[PDB]
Every structure is written in C-alpha cells, then in structure tokens.
Amino acid sequence: NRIVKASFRENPVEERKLFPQSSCLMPISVGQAIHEDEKFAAVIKLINASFKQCTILVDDSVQRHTIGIMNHATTEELYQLAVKEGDEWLKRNQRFYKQLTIPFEIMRWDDWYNSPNYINSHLRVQKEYDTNKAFQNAIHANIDDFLTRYLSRFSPADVDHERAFRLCLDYLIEECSVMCLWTEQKYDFEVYPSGRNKAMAATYEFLIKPHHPNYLRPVALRFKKY
C-alpha cells in the first residue's frame, strides 16, 4: 500500500560517508509527532541502516518548566508530570526502538541534569546569555517561536506572559547547559528531524563547535510517503 520513509536533509555525500562508522544522539522532544508511530519507525529504520551506534535521549524532565506555564502545580508535581510523559513515551515507542540492530542506549533527561558538571555548564550558558548579545537574541527569538506555537490554543487574556517567558527561558537555559555536557560522550552527530532550535544552534556556534567541531554535527530529516 503506502509507507513513510525518512531520508537525510542537506547532509553532503562527504559527511554521509562517515555515518556508518559514526555515533549519533537522538534527543527526543517528548510530545512531538516526529517522535511517534510511522514517523518514529521511519527514523529507527534509517538510523539502523546508516549509523555505527546510536543513543536516544528522552528530553522529559525539562518539560517540567514548559508544563508549568499553564499548569500552576507544585514544582514537585510538574517534575512528576514531566517524568510520567517520558515514562509513557517509552511504553508507546518501545515497539519501534527495540527493532534497532546496531548497538543502542536509552537515556533520560535527569541522567544529564544530575551530572556533576551540570552546574558549571549552567553558569557558562548563563554567562554567555549575559555577556554575548547575539546569543541572548537567539534565545529570545527561540522563546517567541516556541510560545507562539505552545500557547496558540489560548487567548492572550488567560496567559501570564511574564511567567511564560520566565519558565520558557529556564527551559532553554537547561536545554543548552545539558547540550554542552553531550561532548563528554563524544557523539559525532546529533539527529533531530526538524531543525535545531535557535538557542541550541547558537550554543553549538558559540560554546560547542569552537572546542569540538567533530562532535554534535547536526543532521535533519525529510519524510515522504512511498
């Protein structure tokens, strides 16, 4: 009948030649459709076919910040909801990632946030936000981009815009601080189907690429029915 196939986007032949002998990280934005069913299976199939080894991160506990924009629950409650969402993603998509024949690892957000090196990385990101205005602007742009979609189904009247911004900033600072830590596990490529968001692209530009250009090399995918 019909099937979804996940091809690489923009990655040159000279880069793609490296993929079979390279490692990759698959950060999972728990909640997104690109990480579910037909589109997720398509990715597992392409990753299996083209990489040496793979490790899937479940970006779960981070959402405690974003969940908390409209849900005014206790900080422990949101942490729990953010984890529960990761628990359920793993249940839902166990069927697909189990089909990986290459060596793979399943990690979760807390594995990185609780790293001894997190706090120093967090300070580094907060310093760059304060000092470097290009980086500051990228983060701010990312907040606008994210909130216009996240809060699309809400009337501006029911949204605490001060809160939205604050929590979304907390989310992006954590995401970038954890990003920096990834060089520790020497991942050659970072595969996110859509692009890399503005904040993460800025963090790679200013804090990661200058020190390790052969780590976290971005990879985006195209989806098509065949």
Instruction: Give the containing element (helix H, strand E) for 5.
Output: strand 4-9
Long-range contacts of 59-62 (CB under 8 A, 24+ apart): 59/27, 59/28, 59/29, 59/30, 59/109, 59/175, 60/30, 60/85, 60/86, 60/89, 60/108, 60/109, 60/110, 61/86, 61/108, 61/109, 61/110, 61/113, 62/109, 62/113, 62/171, 62/174, 62/175, 62/178
Report which residue type is found at 35: H
How many domains does one find in the chain?
1
Instruction: Give the containing element (helix H, strand E) for 219.
Output: strand 217-225
Experimental approach was X-ray
What's the Cα-to-Cα distance from 28 to each of 21, 117, 200, rounded to whole Å? Answer: 23, 22, 14
Q: Are 14 and 224 in contact, with CB atoms under 8 Å apart? A: no
Instruction: Give the containing element (helix H, strand E) for 190.
Output: strand 189-191
Please name which of 195, 201, 159, 194 lies closest in space to residue 176, comparing C-alpha atoms.
Answer: 201
**Number of Cβ within a 10 Å radius of residue 160:** 12
**Alpha carbons 180 and 61: distance in angstroms, whole number:** 17
Structural domain boundaries enclosing 164: 1-226
Instruction: Give the experimental resolution in Å.
Output: 3.1
